[PDB]
Design an enzyme around this catalytic site. Structure first.
Site, PDB file in Angstrom:
ATOM      1  N   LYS A 133       4.879   7.388  -6.437  1.00  0.00           N
ATOM      2  CA  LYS A 133       5.481   7.690  -5.150  1.00  0.00           C
ATOM      3  C   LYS A 133       5.520   6.443  -4.287  1.00  0.00           C
ATOM      4  O   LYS A 133       4.630   5.600  -4.367  1.00  0.00           O
ATOM      5  CB  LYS A 133       4.657   8.764  -4.450  1.00  0.00           C
ATOM      6  CG  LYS A 133       5.230   9.308  -3.178  1.00  0.00           C
ATOM      7  CD  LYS A 133       4.135   9.929  -2.366  1.00  0.00           C
ATOM      8  CE  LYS A 133       3.652  11.244  -2.900  1.00  0.00           C
ATOM      9  NZ  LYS A 133       4.623  12.330  -2.618  1.00  0.00           N
ATOM     10  N   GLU A 136       0.835  -1.201   0.000  1.00  0.00           N
ATOM     11  CA  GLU A 136       0.000   0.000   0.000  1.00  0.00           C
ATOM     12  C   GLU A 136       0.874   1.256   0.000  1.00  0.00           C
ATOM     13  O   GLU A 136       0.991   1.974   0.996  1.00  0.00           O
ATOM     14  CB  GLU A 136      -1.006  -0.007   1.160  1.00  0.00           C
ATOM     15  CG  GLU A 136      -2.107   1.045   1.030  1.00  0.00           C
ATOM     16  CD  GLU A 136      -3.167   0.928   2.104  1.00  0.00           C
ATOM     17  OE1 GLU A 136      -3.038   0.044   2.972  1.00  0.00           O
ATOM     18  OE2 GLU A 136      -4.138   1.713   2.076  1.00  0.00           O
ATOM     19  N   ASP A 137       1.563   1.417  -1.135  1.00  0.00           N
ATOM     20  CA  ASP A 137       2.325   2.617  -1.481  1.00  0.00           C
ATOM     21  C   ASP A 137       3.508   2.804  -0.535  1.00  0.00           C
ATOM     22  O   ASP A 137       3.735   3.889  -0.010  1.00  0.00           O
ATOM     23  CB  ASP A 137       1.418   3.857  -1.501  1.00  0.00           C
ATOM     24  CG  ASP A 137       2.003   5.019  -2.283  1.00  0.00           C
ATOM     25  OD1 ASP A 137       1.962   4.955  -3.532  1.00  0.00           O
ATOM     26  OD2 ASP A 137       2.472   5.996  -1.651  1.00  0.00           O
ATOM     27  N   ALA A 138       4.245   1.725  -0.290  1.00  0.00           N
ATOM     28  CA  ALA A 138       5.450   1.765   0.522  1.00  0.00           C
ATOM     29  C   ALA A 138       6.489   0.862  -0.113  1.00  0.00           C
ATOM     30  O   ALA A 138       6.190   0.083  -1.017  1.00  0.00           O
ATOM     31  CB  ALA A 138       5.202   1.336   1.966  1.00  0.00           C
TER      32      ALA A 138
END
Ligand SMILES: [Zn+2]
Ligand SMILES: [Zn+2]
Ligand SMILES: [Zn+2]
Lengths: 77, 153, 97, 124, 713, 48, 252
Positions: free
Chosen positions: G196, G60-62
């Site tokens: 990102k 989750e976006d890490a």
DNA sequence: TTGTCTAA
DNA sequence: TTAGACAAT
């Protein structure tokens, strides 16, 4: 003549175990044998399974009346 | 020392001003005396004597027949310092400003005279009564802080 | 924001009382049972007819969880099964309400 | 952002906040909302009264004003035979000035309704 | 020590009879100088020591206590003349446009003001069945004999409003209902609006006097400045004639018109008026400069009376005349500036008053009274983590050497608090801040061990603010909170050398988080009942569903829906050492023997299966005495997704009988089917939802936690 | 008063003399009390 | 992007200048990156990104950055907090005769501030250090101002500014301070395809999945940022950067 | 920007 | 019956 739920609800168990856990703290006497924990919530929750907590509950009906149930006689889930 | 001595050896004869009767209190009790409440209430009342308050108007000196009021004790919202109420045949003392008491001398000088009432009241009595430079009544009575009562006169 | 705040502060008091009637913060009776049958929204998930085969198995697993219902008191269905047989007799004789 | 025994402000003595250092964490209106929706009245009591601006207030049970009691000065008898009592000026009596437990923001509300010529009866 | 036990029962807030304040007060102030040049508070001023003290190093003048435990002392600014009451000014003008000059009665007909006078004392009892009965019987009476001769009361209206007070005599307490205060607000608003039309006087046939309100500060009579000093003489004689009804409109306190007219302004205590610096105007407080302007104008009116004892007031508007209405409206507008700022639209030198302190969203009722800044709370950034449980949170070490929890000393916890005092407040196996039997505290430091062990020998023979540990509850908060699971109570875990808070993946579907620097408030419940409702009621495991419909919202998100579809597929085969590594990766400190399974293929090689690893994990995480669960159903991958060739229709075989669509768990063991989002995600009626509605909360948290740890390892 | 327009409702709660008996969640935090919610709907006793 | 802003850090006095120690030119770049010659100021470092769902923290976006590679210098930075200090626009009580200076016999400025009242160049500053001192010339009473920032910083250079005439008194100064600002947990990266990833966990190098060629990765990226965001350009950039570093080429 | 409350 | 006035995001 008491007609409410015979089952202890969740909030009943929360306040009874909270006050009973404070009725354990400040050198207060305990009524079960203990394996040696320092958290009073474990101690108070083992007396709930023991049905040894003597607390009487005044369930306020909205008139201003109340029934005196006992945690000894209330049926936990 | 607060001495019981078989209900103060019945010193409620004449010339002594004290009244003994039933009352109603409000005791804030610690949860360490959940069981064994008798010594808790009487130990807190032993740690309550010899000062002034309202339900015990003047000052106490003894108490007997501590009986609890009611069937149910009161546990409040967050406190858990359980609140019981007591009716008990107190032996309390009205100081009665304008009376004459006794005196047991231990520390006396030309500046002040120390005499004791009931062996407990450290009453400082001033020695000069403005009579001369070569040498009781009550007008002001107020307690000291730490568990004692004082008499000026 | 504002709409949710107003619906909050006109519904802050509607707690369910011990007599199971939804009363306000002063005694004012809104409903006689919560939600017109009395239940709760989290605990009504396995009451639907398609989750009855799940409760047809797993019966002993839930008997262990709480066993008031067979051999303990406060479990007399007399005054309610009498009532349901009364209602089904009334529909037996008077079909069209 | 970690807060313990921090500096309170002189009006409404709860922790300060205010876009800088040594500032406390706001609980909030919707957190009041959600935590009442949980049913835990005492965690709300903790985080909203016991941990910010809890004050002891003195009311005469006869009248019921938080303004009316007035405490005397200590006597010049040099810390011996001294009273340290309360005097409800509206009652002129040395009785039943009991203590209650209300927030210090509520005392600013009561002593600020008194600026608007309002007084609250407390049923005590 | 001696904490308050005496609770409350109800409040009621009414107004001041002006005699009472002069006994409550301390000092008449009358001095326009706040502080001296050195910083000493000026004598007899608005920040005088005889009010509530402003500093901590000078005691107040009335009491000999410090700033800390002072109550708060108020004074009064006396006025040379009478000003209106701005709380009651818009109800004063609504009375005088209905009243009369020479006769002190009103223009409303007598049937209406008898009907309202009978209806109001019925709604004090809270009968509310009689408020139609009274209008029914007075319409019947007025139909029978219309007359003004019923001066005091009608016989049957007064007779019924005595019988309805006598029946249910204790009905002062049954009138807190919505419906009673509904009619009591509606009827009094209808009398304030509908039956208060400015018109001629009906009973003595006399010309009326109409007043007019202009710019909310001046009352102009029509033959024009009506002085409040003459409105005293009007209102008193009006009220001594109409009190039997105007005490039933206005309950109040005996309700006299000393509350419509202000003869002195009262100051709040100076401890509640703080100091301020570094603005556009420095060294000023708003409710102090408003009363400064009032006191300057009172000095101006005493100058005017000094002139009229037998320039000095060039500054007012008309200096030539000797009377000066204009200074009096100046003072009354300064009173409006004190109580409000919405009623003044003229004076540019004002600060917001006591209405602006209380009303709007940046006020008190929505800023300081319903939501407060709290002690013992933490705010940090969240990041993912998975080796914590779902009912768990990782509290960085910095928080754990700075967030401390209180614990009294039982005989059970002498030794651990003794070790915590041995540690000292920087080192975390647990450390301390001990406070003695009185209010005095120790606040022990870590610069020396000798003082710490000397305190540590005297613990039992005193509670300790011990640091947070690996079982304590922190209350977690990510704003905005829009629903009930948006504030949950996670068990702490103290992880060394970190900066960010760390959460599991099941919880950030409830908090509506995205792990992109969303910063989160972590309150720490300091009390002991606040622990217990957080373990029981606000526990993460107990709130698995949503209040909207009761759908689940705790599950596994991304890697696990691929590992479950890869592992529980039919093709996996583990040997003995891989199986016994994966099962123990799924578990961690399982208290008992790990109850393993047999191989699914016993010969040629002991090959396990991917389904038996999940089954072993289920049988080990379901509790010891409880028998495992059955289940059946359907998964997210259909049967058309495993097809590669063209299917041939064999005669007597339905392919869904043997298909991987159907998850057919029997006795807690997987026997068919693939686990997907449909069985351990946020999707309803799956494995981790059935384990919620059979075994409870903590087991259904352990299923998500252990199936995460298995499917990563 | 806490909801909206506190000045008008303090006017209509001082002109009428309104009293409230403190059984509401929005009022039980203005004064320091415990609401009639879940864990404040009953009080709690010890026998003997 | 924290990149290399400018070449003259000594005579420019901005508030914040985010500098990246050792950036690299990209191996796979379009022709407009060289038509404008952007290699004067490059903005990022190359990285051996392996797309694997290996750890558990990688969701989750890490993402996961190698710990030893972080320790060897991967995307190390600096941020230059410069602070123009004026003794008349801020400190105004009387006569405006405030020059910087230390009064002899002041223990607060011993070895921390120089003999002129300004700190040393190269001297580290922490929260609670004396930051500058200014000597009221008419009375003789020197004051002191303390460094009230949280971060630790090193005084890079101090420039003494006069007025526009050339006759200003010694009362204006502009201290410039390096602040290190290395990658910590919670520092967001990105590629050049707009994806990102916050830094979640620095995973040690022996735990990294080494390849068959002996290489550990450098940054672990999730396969679960791809199906919803559809960055095919990141996969072709991955193949193209690998095929350019294996050949010495630079790919269009 | 609504939506009702107040005054002409 | 219709225009100013008052509060909220
Ligand atoms: Zn009183
Ligand atoms: Zn004082
Ligand atoms: Zn008239």
């Amino acid at each position: 003549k008491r007609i409410t739920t015979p089952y202890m609800t969740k909030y009943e168990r929360a306040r009874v175990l909270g006050t009973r856990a404070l009725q354990i703290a400040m050198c207060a006497p305990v009524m079960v044998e203990l394996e040696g924990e320092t958290d009073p919530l474990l101690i108070a929750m083992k007396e709930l399974k023991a049905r040894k907590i003597p607390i009487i509950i005044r369930r306020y009906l909205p008139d201003g009346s109340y029934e005196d149930w006992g945690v000894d006689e209330l049926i936990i889930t | 020392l607060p001495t019981y001595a078989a209900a103060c050896a019945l010193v409620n004869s004449r010339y002594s001003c004290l009244v003994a009767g039933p009352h109603q209190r409000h005791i804030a009790l610690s949860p360490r005396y959940l069981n064994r409440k008798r010594t808790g209430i009487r130990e807190q009342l032993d740690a309550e004597l010899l000062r002034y308050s309202e339900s015990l108007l003047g000052v106490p000196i003894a108490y007997d027949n501590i009986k609890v009021v009611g069937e149910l004790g009161d546990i409040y919202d967050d406190q858990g310092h359980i609140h019981l109420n007591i009716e008990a045949d107190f032996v309390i003392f009205c100081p009665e400003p304008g009376q004459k008491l006794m005196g047991i001398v231990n520390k006396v000088s030309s500046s002040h005279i120390g005499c004791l009432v009931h062996g407990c009241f450290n009453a400082s009595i001033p020695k000069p009564e403005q009579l001369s430079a070569e040498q009781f009544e009550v007008f002001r009575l107020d307690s000291d802080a730490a568990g004692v009562f004082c008499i000026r006169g | 924001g504002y709409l949710q705040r107003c619906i909050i502060k006109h519904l802050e008091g509607l707690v369910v009382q011990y007599d199971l009637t939804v009363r306000d913060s002063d005694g004012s009776v809104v409903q006689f049972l919560y939600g017109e049958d009395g239940l709760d929204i989290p605990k009504t998930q396995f009451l639907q007819p398609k989750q009855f085969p799940f409760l047809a198995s797993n019966y002993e697993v839930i008997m262990k969880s709480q066993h008031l219902h067979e051999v303990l008191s406060r479990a007399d269905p007399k005054k309610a099964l009498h009532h349901f047989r009364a209602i089904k007799k009334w529909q037996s004789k008077h079909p069209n309400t | 952002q970690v807060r313990t025994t921090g500096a309170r402000d002189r009006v409404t003595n709860q922790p300060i906040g205010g876009r800088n250092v040594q500032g406390g964490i706001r609980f909030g209106e919707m957190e009041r909302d959600a935590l009442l929706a949980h049913g835990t009245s005492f965690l709300l009591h903790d985080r909203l009264f016991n941990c910010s601006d809890r004050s002891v207030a003195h009311v005469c049970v006869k009248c019921g004003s938080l303004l009316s009691p007035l405490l005397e000065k200590p006597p010049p008898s040099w810390s011996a035979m001294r009273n340290r009592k309360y005097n409800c000026t509206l009652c002129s009596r040395s009785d039943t000035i009991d203590t209650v437990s209300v927030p210090y923001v509520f005392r600013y509300f009561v002593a600020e309704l008194a600026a608007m010529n309002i007084k609250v009866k407390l049923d005590v | 020590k001696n904490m308050p036990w005496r609770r409350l029962q109800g409040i009621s807030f009414g107004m001041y009879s002006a005699e009472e304040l002069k006994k409550l007060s301390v000092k008449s102030i009358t001095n326009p100088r706040y502080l001296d040049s050195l910083g000493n508070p000026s004598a007899n001023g608005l920040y005088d020591l005889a009010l509530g003290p402003a500093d901590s190093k000078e005691v107040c003048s009335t009491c000999v206590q410090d700033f800390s435990n002072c109550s708060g002392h108020l004074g009064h600014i006396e006025l040379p003349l009478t000003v209106y009451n701005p709380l009651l000014f818009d109800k004063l003008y609504l009375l005088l446009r209905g009243s009369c000059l020479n006769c002190h009665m009103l223009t409303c007909p007598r049937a209406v003001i008898h009907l309202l006078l009978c209806q109001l004392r019925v709604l004090e009892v809270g009968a509310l069945q009689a408020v139609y009965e009274l209008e029914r019987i007075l319409n019947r009476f007025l139909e029978e004999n219309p007359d003004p001769s019923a001066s005091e009361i009608r016989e049957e209206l007064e007779q019924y409003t005595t019988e309805i007070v006598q029946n249910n005599l204790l009905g002062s307490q049954g009138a807190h209902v919505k419906n009673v205060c509904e009619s009591k607000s509606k009827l009094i608003a209808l009398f304030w609006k509908a039956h208060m039309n400015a018109k001629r006087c009906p009973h003595c046939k006399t010309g009326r006097s109409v007043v007019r309100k202009e710019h909310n500060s001046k009352l102009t009579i029509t033959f024009g400045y009506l002085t409040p000093t003459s409105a005293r003489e009007h209102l008193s004689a009006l009220w001594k004639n109409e009190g039997f009804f105007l005490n039933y409109l206005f309950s109040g306190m005996r309700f006299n018109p000393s509350v419509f007219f202000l003869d002195f302004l009262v100051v709040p205590p100076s401890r509640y008026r703080p100091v301020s610096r570094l603005g556009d105007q420095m060294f000023t407080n708003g409710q102090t400069v408003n009363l400064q302007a009032v006191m300057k104008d009172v000095v101006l009116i005493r100058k005017l009376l000094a002139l009229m004892a037998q320039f000095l007031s060039t500054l007012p508007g008309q200096s030539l005349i000797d009377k000066l209405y204009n200074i009096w409206i100046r003072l009354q507008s300064h009173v409006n500036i004190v109580f409000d700022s919405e009623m003044d639209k003229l004076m540019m030198d004002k600060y917001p008053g006591i209405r602006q302190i209380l009303e709007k969203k940046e006020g008190l009722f929505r800023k300081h009274m319903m939501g407060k800044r709290v002690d013992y709370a933490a705010r940090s950034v969240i990041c993912p983590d998975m080796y914590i449980n779902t009912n768990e949170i990782g509290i960085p070490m910095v928080f754990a050497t700075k967030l401390t929890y209180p614990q009294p000393v039982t005989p059970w916890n002498v030794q651990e608090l003794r070790q915590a005092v041995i540690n000292g407040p920087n080192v975390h196996p647990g450390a301390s801040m001990v406070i003695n039997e009185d209010g005095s505290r120790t606040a022990l430091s870590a610069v020396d061990m000798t003082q710490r062990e000397a305190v540590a020998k005297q613990l039992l023979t005193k509670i300790v603010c011990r640091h947070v540990k690996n079982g304590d509850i922190l209350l977690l908060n990510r704003q905005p909170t829009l629903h009930r699971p948006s504030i949950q109570a996670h068990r702490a875990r103290i992880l060394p050398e970190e900066k960010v808070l760390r959460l599991h993946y099941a919880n950030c579907k409830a908090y509506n988080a995205d792990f992109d620097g969303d910063e989160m408030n972590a309150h720490f419940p300091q009390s002991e009942l606040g622990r217990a409702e957080a373990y029981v009621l606000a526990c993460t495991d107990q709130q698995y569903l949503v209040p909207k419909d009761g759908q689940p919202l705790a599950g596994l998100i991304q890697d696990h829906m691929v590992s479950g579809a890869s592992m529980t597929t039919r093709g996996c085969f583990f040997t003995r050492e891989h199986y016994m590594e994966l099962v123990y990766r799924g578990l961690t400190d399982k208290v008992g023997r790990v109850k393993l399974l047999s191989p699914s293929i016993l010969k040629p090689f002991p090959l396990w299966t991917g389904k038996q690893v999940v089954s072993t994990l289920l049988i080990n995480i379901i509790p010891e005495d409880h028998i495992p669960l059955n289940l059946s159903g359907k998964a997210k991958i259909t049967g058309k997704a495993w097809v590669k060739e063209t299917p041939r229709s064999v005669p007597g075989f339905n392919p869904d009988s043997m298909c991987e669509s159907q998850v057919i768990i029997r006795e807690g063991e997987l026997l068919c089917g693939v686990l997907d989002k449909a069985h351990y995600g946020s999707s309803a009626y799956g494995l981790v939802h059935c384990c919620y509605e059979i075994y409870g909360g903590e087991t259904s948290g352990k299923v998500l936690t252990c199936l995460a740890r298995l499917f990563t390892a | 008063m806490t909801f909206e327009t506190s000045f008008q409702f303090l006017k209509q709660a001082t002109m009428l003399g309104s009293h409230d008996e403190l059984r509401s969640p929005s009022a039980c935090l203005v004064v320091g009390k415990v609401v009639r919610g879940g864990t404040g709907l009953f009080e709690l006793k010890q026998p003997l | 992007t924290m990149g290399f802003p400018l070449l003259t850090y000594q005579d420019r006095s901005d508030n914040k200048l985010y500098r990246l120690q050792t950036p690299q030119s990209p191996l796979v770049r379009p022709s407009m990156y060289d038509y404008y010659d952007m290699d004067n100021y490059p903005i990022g470092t190359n990285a051996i990104v392996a797309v694997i769902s290996y750890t558990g923290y990688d969701m989750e976006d890490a993402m996961i950055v190698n710990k030893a590679s972080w320790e060897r210098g991967f995307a190390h930075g600096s941020v230059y907090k410069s602070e123009f200090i004026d003794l008349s626009e801020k400190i105004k009580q009387g006569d405006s005769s405030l020059v910087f200076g230390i009064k002899p016999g002041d223990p607060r400025v011993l070895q921390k501030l120089d003999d002129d009242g300004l700190p040393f160049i190269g001297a580290k500053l922490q929260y609670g250090d004396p930051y500058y001192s200014y000597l009221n010339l008419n009375t003789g009473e020197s004051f002191v101002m303390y460094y009230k920032s949280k971060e630790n910083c090193v005084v890079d250079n101090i420039k003494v500014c006069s007025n526009d005439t050339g006759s200003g008194k010694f009362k204006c100064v502009c201290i410039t301070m390096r602040v290190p600002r290395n990658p910590t947990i919670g520092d967001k990266f990105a590629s050049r395809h707009g994806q990102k990833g916050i830094l979640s966990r620095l995973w040690p190098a022996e735990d990294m999945p080494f390849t068959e060629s002996g290489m550990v990765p450098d940054i672990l990226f999730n396969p679960h940022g791809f199906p919803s965001r559809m960055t095919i350009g990141m996969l072709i950039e991955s193949m193209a950067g690998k095929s350019a570093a294996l050949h010495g080429l630079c790919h269009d």
